[PDB]
Design a protein around this ligand. Structure first.
Ligand code: BCL
Ligand code: BCL
Ligand code: BCL
Ligand code: BCL
Ligand SMILES: CC[C@H]1c2cc3[nH]c4c(c3C)C(=O)[C@H](C(=O)OC)c4c3nc(cc4[nH]c(cc(n2)[C@@H]1C)c(C(C)=O)c4C)[C@@H](C)[C@@H]3CCC(=O)OC/C=C(\C)CCC[C@H](C)CCC[C@H](C)CCCC(C)C
Ligand SMILES: CC[C@H]1c2cc3[nH]c4c(c3C)C(=O)[C@H](C(=O)OC)c4c3nc(cc4[nH]c(cc(n2)[C@@H]1C)c(C(C)=O)c4C)[C@@H](C)[C@@H]3CCC(=O)OC/C=C(\C)CCC[C@H](C)CCC[C@H](C)CCCC(C)C
Ligand SMILES: COC1=C(OC)C(=O)C(C/C=C(\C)CC/C=C(\C)CC/C=C(\C)CC/C=C(\C)CC/C=C(\C)CC/C=C(\C)CC/C=C(\C)CC/C=C(\C)CC/C=C(\C)CCC=C(C)C)=C(C)C1=O
Ligand SMILES: CCCCCCCCCCCCCCCCCC(=O)OC[C@H](COP(=O)([O-])OCC[N+](C)(C)C)OC(=O)CCCCCCCCCCCCCCCCC
Ligand SMILES: COC(C)(C)C/C=C/C(C)=C/C=C/C(C)=C/C=C/C(C)=C/C=C\C=C(C)\C=C\C=C(/C)CC/C=C(\C)CCC=C(C)C
Ligand SMILES: CCCCCCCCCCCC[N+](C)(C)[O-]
Ligand SMILES: CCCCCCCCCCCC[N+](C)(C)[O-]
Ligand SMILES: CCCCCCCCCCCC[N+](C)(C)[O-]
Ligand SMILES: CCCCCCCCCCCC[N+](C)(C)[O-]
Ligand SMILES: CCCCCCCCCCCC[N+](C)(C)[O-]
Ligand SMILES: [Fe+3]
Ligand SMILES: [K+]
Lengths: 302, 281, 240
C-alpha cells in the first residue's frame, strides 16, 4: 500500500561530509567515524566527525570522572564481586552528606565526601558542556538558541543539586546518585512537601511536558505528511514558502481554526519544551525554602 | 476570512461520507460529516456535564466533577446521578475524539497530504480508552476509571498509583517516562537548531541545513538530519504514549502487587541470589 | 507570599509569550482576505508584527515578512455558491491548472543551493562518489501507475548531496523524455516501482524541468503538486 516515509526505502552514500568550515578551527575536528546502514534506514548513516578542543576534553574528562567516582563506590558496596555488582546495580547509591555536616566539606569520604567529589566533577562537566553549545554555534555564525534552551535544563539540575541545598543550609537535601535511590528521593520529596500535585509550578511543568509530546507528535506528523512536497527542508520553506508549508498551515487552520508558519512552529516548539524545566525549577526551588507544604499553601490560595 | 494563499486549496472533494452535503467551511473551520458528528457528540457531552453539575450543586469549574459508577455496579449501567452520566459522557467523548480524527482524515484527503496526523492522534485516543474502557473492562468495573474533574482526576492518579506502592517501579512506566523526557529534549534541540540557523548572528546570512548537520556533528559526533528529526519526534512522542497505555493496562490485571517487588525476579536469579554482600545479601 | 507572587508573574509572562508567539506566526498569509482577494474586515485581535528581514546566502537577496502577499499566478477556480464558505470548482482540468490538491506555489525559479553554493539536488549520475548504499536499487525498474499499466522506467535517482538522500526518481516515458517522481510517492518493489497517485496516462502531464541536470524550487512545486493531486483526481482510473 502507500509508502509512509517512516523508514527509507533506498539509502544513498557519497564522500564523507566534513561539514561547513566558517570560523571553526579544523585542527580540532576528528575524522569521520564509520557509516551505519542501520541508522541510515531512519536518519543519517554518517558518524562523525566530532569537534574536540580544550573545553571538550575538560568536559569529557570531568564527566568520566563523575561516572567513575560513582562506579567505584558501587564496586565497593558490591564487595568487589562482579556477580553482586550486576545483581544489585540498581540498588547501589552514592549518597550526599548527612544533615549534621550542613554545607561543610568536612564529611568523611564514605559518608558524603565522595558524593561531593562526584558532584564537583558533574558541575564542571555540565557547565563546560554548556560553554561548548555556545561556542560551537558561535564558530558557525549561528544563533545561540541551543545554549539558551540547554540553560533551562541546567536550571532544574542546578536547583536540585546545588541552589536548593544551599538555601536549605545542607547538602543532605540533594539528590543521590543511583537508579532506584533517585526515584525514592523523588517520591519522598513530594510526600515531605505535602504532595507536588498541589504545587502550581509542577502542574504547569506537566502541562508543558505533555504539551511537548503533543506538539512534537503534531509537528513530526505534519512534516512527514508534507514530505511529498519537500516539507522537511524547513529553512528554504522559511526563505521561500512552498506548497508544503501552505498545506501544513491549512491542515491546522481547517482543523482547529488557526495555524503556524514554518519558522514560528519552531518558536512554539522551543518554548513548549524549555517551559518544562523552567517552571519545574521554580517549583522545586520554592519547595521547603518558602513553602513547606503545597496542600496547605493551596488552601490559602496564597 | 482566508489566508492569502488559501483559496486554491478550497476545492470540492475528500469527504468520506455524504458527498457534497457537508463539504464547506465556517470561517476557518472545515466541517464535513465528521465535523457535524463532532459538534453533536461534544455538544451533548457538554450539556450532560452541565446537568451533572446541577445534580452535584456547583458551577465552579474547579469543583465540577463527574464520577463513574462505584465499584458495586461492576460493568452494568447506573442511574444517571450515580455514574450514568459519566457513562454517557464517556461515550460522547469517544464519539467526539474519533469523529475529530476522521474529520482530520477528510482534511488530509482534500489537501492531498499523508495521514500521519490522525494516525498520531489515534494514539492519544487509545491512551484515553485504555483508562476509561479497556482497563476498567478487564478489571471488571467502570469505577476503576478516572473522574472528570480538574482536581479530582489528580486524586485518582495519586490513589491509583499508591495502590501499588511507589509507581515509579512499574517498568513500562519507566520506559514511558524516558520517552517523554527524551521527547522534550529532542523538541528543545529541534526548535533551537532550526531557529539558530534561520536567525544567525547579526548581519549574517541565513545558515543552511549543512550548518545544522555541522553543528550537531561538532557537538556530539552525530546529526540525525532534517528528515530524521521529524521521524524521531514522532517516534518518541508516540512511543511515550504507547508505553503509558501499556504501563496502565498491565496494572491491576496481570500485575496487582507492589511494583517495587516485581524487581525481585532479577535479584533472585539462581547464579547470584545467595552470594553474600551488596545491598541484597 | 513569594510563591503567590511567582505564580501571578508567571501567568503574566505566559500571556505575553503567547501574544509574541501568535504574532510571530502571522508573518505569512496575513492580512486575511475574502474569497475575492480583498482584505477581510475581521483580522482578529492580534496585530501584524513589525517586519524582520532574513538575509539569504549566495546573493539570492532578502525576505522581509510580513510583506505584501500575492499568489503571482492565475488561479483557475470559481465560486459554487452565492455566499462565503463553500468550495470553489476547477474551471478547467485541476491537474493541469495546478489547483486543489494539485496546487503549486510560485516559489523562486532557481535551484536550492547547499552551503557551498552548489546545487542541493542532482541526478546521481552527475553526483561524484554517490551510489546506492542499501535497499533495492530502483534504477532500471519498470514504473507502474494505479491503472496497473507500465508508464515508463527508472533511469536515475536524484539525490540531495549535503543530506545524502534519495529525493526523486527520474522516469523515462515511451517518447524518450523523462519526468521526476517524488521519492515519497513511490513504492520500490522487487520487480517494479508502483505509483498509486497516477495512472499511466497522466505521466506525460507531469511538469517538465527546463534543464536536465537541475530542478528549480518552482519546478519541484509543480511536480510534487501534480503527483499528489492525482490521489483525488485520478481516483476514477484507480482500481483493485
Ligand atoms: C524529574 C525528577 C527526578 C527524576 C525522576 C525520574 C523518574 C520518575 C524516572 C527517571 C528516569 C531516569 N532518570 Mg531521572 N530524575 C531526576 C533527575 C535525573 C538526572 C539529573 C538531574 O542529572 C539524571 C541524569 C537522571 C537520569 C535518569 C535515567 C536513569 C532515566 C531516564 C532519563 C532520560 O530518559 O532522559 C534523557 C534521555 C537521554 C537519552 C539522555 C541521557 C541518557 C542516559 C540514560 C542518562 C545517564 C544516567 C546514568 C549515568 C546511566 C547509568 C546506567 C548504568 C548504571 C550503567 N534523572 C530528578 C531528580 N527520573 C526513568 C527511569 O527509567 O529510571 C529508572 C524514570 O522512570
Ligand atoms: C494523562 C494521565 C492522567 C492525567 C494526569 C494529569 C496530571 C498529573 C496533571 C494533569 C493536568 C491536566 N490535565 Mg490531566 N490527566 C489525564 C487525562 C486528562 C484528560 C483526558 C481527556 O484524558 C484531559 C482533558 C486532561 C486535562 C488536564 C488539564 C486540566 C491539566 C493540563 C493538561 C495539559 O496541559 O496537557 C497538554 C495539552 C495539550 C496537548 C492541549 C491542551 C488541552 C487543554 C489544556 C485541556 C483543557 C481541558 C478542559 C479543562 C476539559 C474540559 C472539557 C470541557 C467540557 C470542554 N487530563 C489522565 C487521567 N493531568 C495538570 C494539572 O495542572 O491538573 C490540575 C497536572 O498536573
Ligand atoms: C511520587 C512522585 C511525585 C512527583 C515528584 C516530582 C519531583 C521531586 C520532581 C518532579 C518533576 C516533574 N514531574 Mg512529578 N511527581 C509526581 C507525579 C508526576 C506525574 C504523573 C503523576 O502523571 C507527571 C506526568 C509528572 C511530571 C513531572 C515533570 C513535568 C517534571 C520534570 C520535568 C523534566 O523534564 O525533568 C527531567 C529533566 C532534568 C532532570 C534536567 C536534567 C539536565 C542536566 C543538565 C542533565 C545532566 C546529564 C548528565 C550529565 C548525564 C549525562 C549522560 C549522557 C549519556 C551523556 N510528575 C508525584 C506527585 N516530580 C521535577 C520538577 O520540576 O518538579 C516541579 C522534580 O524535581
Ligand atoms: C502518585 C502518582 C504516581 C504515578 C502514578 C500514575 C498513574 C495512575 C498514571 C500515571 C501515568 C503517567 N505517568 Mg506517572 N506516576 C508517578 C510519577 C510520574 C513522574 C515523576 C517525575 O515522578 C512522571 C514523569 C510520570 C509520567 C507518567 C506518564 C508515563 C503517564 C502520563 C501521560 C499519559 O498517559 O498520556 C496519555 C494521554 C492522555 C490520556 C490524553 C488523551 C487525550 C484525549 C484523546 C483528548 C482530550 C481532548 C480534550 C477533552 C479537548 C478539550 C477541548 C478544548 C478545545 C481544548 N509519572 C507517581 C509515582 N502515573 C498515566 C498513564 O500511563 O496513563 C495511561 C496513569 O494513568
Ligand atoms: C528543556 C528541557 C529538556 C532538556 C533540554 C536540553 N538538554 C540538553 C540540551 C538541551 C537544549 C543540550 O544542548 C545538551 C546536549 O548536548 O544535547 C545533545 C543537553 C543534554 N542533556 C542531557 C541529558 C538529559 N537531559 C534531560 C532533560 C532535558 N533536557 C529536558 C526534558 C535528562 C533527563 C530527562 O533526566 C537527561 C538525562 C545530555 C545528553 C546533554 C548534556 C551533556 C552533558 O552535560 O555532558 C557532561 C557529561 C559528559 C561530557 C560525559 C559523561 C560520561 C558518560 C555517562 C559515560 C558513559 C558511557 C561510557 C562509554 C562508559 C565507559 C565505561 C567502560 C570503561 C566500560
Ligand atoms: C499521542 C501523543 C500526544 C498527543 C498527540 C496529539 N494530540 C492531538 C493531535 C495529536 C497528533 C491532534 O491532531 C489533535 C489536535 O487537533 O490538536 C490541536 C489533538 C488534541 N489533543 C488534545 C488534548 C490532549 N492531548 C493530550 C496528549 C497527547 N496528544 C499525547 C501526549 C492531553 C493530555 C496529555 O492530558 C490532552 C488534554 C486536544 C486539544 C486535541 C483533540 C481535540 C478534540 O478531540 O476535539 C473534539 C472534542 C471536543 C472539542 C470536546 C469533547 C468534549 C467531551 C465530549 C466532554 C469532555 C469529556 C472529557 C473526558 C473531560 C475530562 C476533563 C478532565 C480530565 C479535567
Ligand atoms: C510546520 O507546519 C505546522 C503548522 O503550519 C505551518 C501548524 O500550524 C502546526 C500546528 C501548531 C500550532 C499552531 C502551535 C500551537 C498549538 C499547540 C500549542 C497545540 C495545542 C492547541 C490548542 C490547545 C488549541 C486547541 C483548540 C482546538 C482543538 C479547537 C477549539 C475550537 C473548536 C473545537 C471549534 C469547533 C469545531 C468543530 C466542533 C468542528 C467543526 C464544526 C462546526 C463548526 C459545525 C504544526 C504542528 C506544524 O507542524
Ligand atoms: C547520539 C550520540 C552518538 C555518538 C557517536 C560518536 C561518533 C564519533 C566518531 C569519531 C571517530 O571517528 O572515531 C574516534 C576518533 C578517531 O580519530 P580520527 O581518526 O577521526 O582523527 C584523525 C584526525 N586528523 C585527520 C586531523 C589527523 O577520535 C575520538 O577520540 C573521538 C571519540 C569520542 C566518542 C564520542 C563522544 C561522545 C559525545 C556524546 C554526546 C553526549 C555527551 C557525552
Ligand atoms: C563498570 O564499572 C566502572 C567502574 C567501569 C564504571 C561503572 C559506573 C557506574 C555503575 C555508574 C553509575 C552511575 C549512575 C547510576 C548515576 C545516576 C545518576 C543520577 C540518577 C543522577 C540524578 C540526579 C542528579 C542531580 C540532580 C545532580 C545535581 C548536581 C549538581 C547540580 C552539582 C552540584 C555540585 C556540588 C554540590 C559540588 C559543589 C562543590 C564545590 C567545591 C563548590
Ligand atoms: C535561568 C534559566 C533561563 C533560561 C531561559 C532562556 C530561554 C531561551 C529560549 C530561546 C529564546 C532566545 N531568543 C534569542 C530567541 O530570544
Ligand atoms: C523484562 C523487561 C525489562 C525492561 C525494564 C528496563 C527498564 C530500564 C529503563 C531504561 C533506562 C536504562 N538505563 C538504566 C540503562 O539507563
Ligand atoms: C536517540 C534516541 C535514544 C532512544 C532511547 C530513549 C530511552 C528509552 C528507554 C529504553 C527503550 C526500550 N525499548 C523501547 C527499546 O525497548
Ligand atoms: C510580559 C511580557 C513578557 C513576554 C515576552 C516574551 C518574548 C521573548 C522573545 C524575545 C525575542 C525578542 N526580539 C523580538 C527582539 O527578538
Ligand atoms: C495555549 C494554546 C494555544 C494558544 C491559543 C492562541 C490562539 C490564537 C488564535 C488566533 C486567531 C487567528 N485568526 C487568524 C483566526 O485570527
Ligand atoms: Fe521542524
Ligand atoms: K555518481
Amino acid at each position: 500500500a502507500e509508502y509512509q516515509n517512516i523508514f527509507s526505502q533506498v539509502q544513498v552514500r557519497g564522500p564523507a561530509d566534513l561539514g561547513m568550515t566558517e570560523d571553526v578551527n579544523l585542527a580540532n575536528r576528528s575524522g569521520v567515524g564509520p557509516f551505519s546502514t542501520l541508522l541510515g534506514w531512519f536518519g543519517n548513516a554518517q558518524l562523525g566527525p566530532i569537534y574536540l578542543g580544550s573545553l571538550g576534553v575538560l568536559s569529557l574528562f570531568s564527566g568520566l570522572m563523575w561516572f567513575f567516582t560513582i562506579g567505584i563506590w558501587f564496586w565497593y558496596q558490591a564487595g568487589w564481586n562482579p556477580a553482586v555488582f550486576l545483581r544489585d546495580l540498581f540498588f547501589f547509591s552514592l549518597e550526599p552528606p548527612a544533615p549534621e555536616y550542613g554545607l561543610s566539606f568536612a564529611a568523611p569520604l564514605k559518608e558524603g565526601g565522595l558524593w561531593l567529589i562526584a558532584s564537583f566533577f558533574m558541575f564542571v562537566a555540565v557547565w563546560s558542556w554548556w560553554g561548548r553549545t555556545y561556542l560551537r554555534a558561535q564558530a558557525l555564525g549561528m544563533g545561540k538558541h541551543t545554549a539558551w534552551a540547554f540553560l533551562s535544563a541546567i536550571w532544574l539540575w542546578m536547583v536540585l543539586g546545588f541552589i536548593r541545598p544551599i538555601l536549605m543550609g545542607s547538602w543532605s537535601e540533594a539528590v543521590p546518585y543511583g537508579i532506584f535511590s533517585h526515584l525514592d528521593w523523588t517520591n519522598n520529596f513530594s510526600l515531605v512537601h505535602g504532595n507536588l500535585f498541589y504545587n502550581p509550578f509542577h502542574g504547569l511543568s506537566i502541562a508543558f511536558l505533555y504539551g511537548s509530546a503533543g506538539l512534537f507528535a503534531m509537528h513530526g506528523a505534519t512534516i512527514l505528511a508534507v514530505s511529498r512536497f519537500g516539507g522537511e527542508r524547513e529553512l528554504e520553506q522559511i526563505a521561500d514558502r512552498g506548497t508544503a508549508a501552505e498545506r501544513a498551515a491549512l491542515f491546522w487552520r481547517w482543523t482547529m481554526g488557526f495555524n503556524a508558519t514554518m519558522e514560528g512552529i519552531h518558536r512554539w516548539a522551543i518554548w513548549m519544551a524549555v517551559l518544562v524545566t523552567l517552571t519545574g525549577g521554580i517549583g522545586i526551588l520554592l519547595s521547603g525554602t518558602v513553602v513547606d507544604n503545597w496542600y496547605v499553601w493551596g488552601q490559602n490560595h496564597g | 476570512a482566508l489566508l492569502s494563499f488559501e483559496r486554491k486549496y478550497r476545492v470540492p472533494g475528500g469527504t468520506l461520507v455524504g458527498g457534497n452535503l457537508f463539504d464547506f467551511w465556517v470561517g476557518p473551520f472545515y466541517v464535513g460529516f465528521f465535523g457535524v458528528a463532532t459538534f453533536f457528540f461534544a455538544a451533548l457531552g457538554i450539556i450532560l456535564i452541565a446537568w451533572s453539575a446541577v445534580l452535584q450543586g456547583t458551577w465552579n469549574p474547579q469543583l465540577i466533577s463527574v464520577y463513574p459508577p462505584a465499584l458495586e455496579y461492576g460493568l452494568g449501567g447506573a442511574p444517571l446521578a450515580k455514574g450514568g452520566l459519566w457513562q454517557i459522557i464517556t461515550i460522547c467523548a469517544t464519539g467526539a475524539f474519533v469523529s475529530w480524527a476522521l474529520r482530520e482524515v477528510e482534511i488530509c484527503r482534500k489537501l492531498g497530504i499523508g495521514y500521519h496526523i490522525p494516525f498520531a492522534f489515534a494514539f492519544a485516543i487509545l491512551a484515553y480508552l485504555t483508562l476509561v474502557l479497556f482497563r476498567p473492562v478487564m478489571m471488571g468495573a467502570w469505577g476503576y476509571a478516572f473522574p472528570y474533574g480538574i482536581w479530582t482526576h489528580l486524586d485518582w492518579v495519586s490513589n491509583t498509583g499508591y495502590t501499588y506502592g511507589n509507581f515509579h517501579y512499574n517498568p513500562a512506566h519507566m520506559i514511558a517516562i524516558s520517552f517523554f523526557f527524551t521527547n522534550a529534549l529532542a523538541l528543545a534541540l529541534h526548535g533551537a537548531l532550526v531557529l539558530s540557523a534561520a536567525n544567525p548572528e547579526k548581519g549574517k546570512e541565513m545558515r543552511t541545513p549543512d550548518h545544522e548537520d555541522t553543528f550537531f556533528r561538532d557537538l556530539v559526533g552525530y546529526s540525525i538530519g532534517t528528515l530524521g528529526i521529524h521521524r524521531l519526534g514522532l517516534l518518541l512522542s508516540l512511543s511515550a504514549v504507547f508505553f503509558s497505555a501499556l504501563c496502565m493496562i498491565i496494572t491491576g490485571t496481570i500485575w496487582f502487587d507492589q511494583w517495587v517487588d516485581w524487581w525481585q525476579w532479577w535479584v533472585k536469579l539462581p547464579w547470584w541470589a545467595n552470594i553474600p554482600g551488596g545491598i541484597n545479601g | 507570599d513569594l510563591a503567590s507572587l511567582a505564580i501571578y508573574s508567571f501567568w503574566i509572562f505566559l500571556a505575553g509569550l503567547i501574544y509574541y508567539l501568535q504574532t510571530e506566526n502571522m508573518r505569512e498569509g496575513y492580512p486575511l482576505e475574502n474569497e475575492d482577494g480583498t482584505p477581510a474586515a475581521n483580522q482578529g485581535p492580534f496585530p501584524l508584527p513589525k517586519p524582520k528581514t532574513f538575509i539569504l546566502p549566495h546573493g539570492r537577496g532578502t525576505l522581509t515578512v510580513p510583506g505584501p502577499e500575492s499568489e503571482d499566478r492565475p488561479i483557475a477556480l470559481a465560486r459554487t455558491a452565492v455566499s462565503e464558505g463553500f468550495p470553489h470548482a476547477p474551471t478547467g482540468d485541476p491537474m493541469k491548472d495546478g489547483v486543489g490538491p494539485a496546487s503549486w506555489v510560485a516559489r523562486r525559479d532557481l535551484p536550492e543551493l547547499d552551503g557551498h553554493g552548489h546545487n542541493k539536488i542532482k541526478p546521481m549520475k552527475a553526483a561524484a562518489g554517490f551510489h546506492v548504499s542499501a535497499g533495492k536499487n530502483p534504477i532500471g525498474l519498470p514504473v507502474r501507475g494505479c491503472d496497473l499499466e507500465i508508464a515508463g522506467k527508472v533511469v536515475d535517482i536524484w539525490v540531495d548531496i549535503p543530506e545524502q538522500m534519495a529525493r526523486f526518481l527520474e522516469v523515462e516515458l515511451k517518447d524518450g523524455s523523462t519526468r521526476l517522481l517524488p521519492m515519497q510517492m513511490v513504492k520500490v518493489q522487487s520487480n517494479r516501482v508502483h505509483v498509486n497517485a497516477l495512472s499511466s496516462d497522466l505521466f506525460a502531464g507531469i511538469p517538465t524541468i527546463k534543464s536536465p541536470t537541475e530542478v528549480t524550487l518552482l519546478e519541484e512545486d509543480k511536480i510534487c503538486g501534480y503527483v499528489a493531486g492525482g490521489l483525488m483526481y485520478a481516483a476514477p482510473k484507480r482500481k483493485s
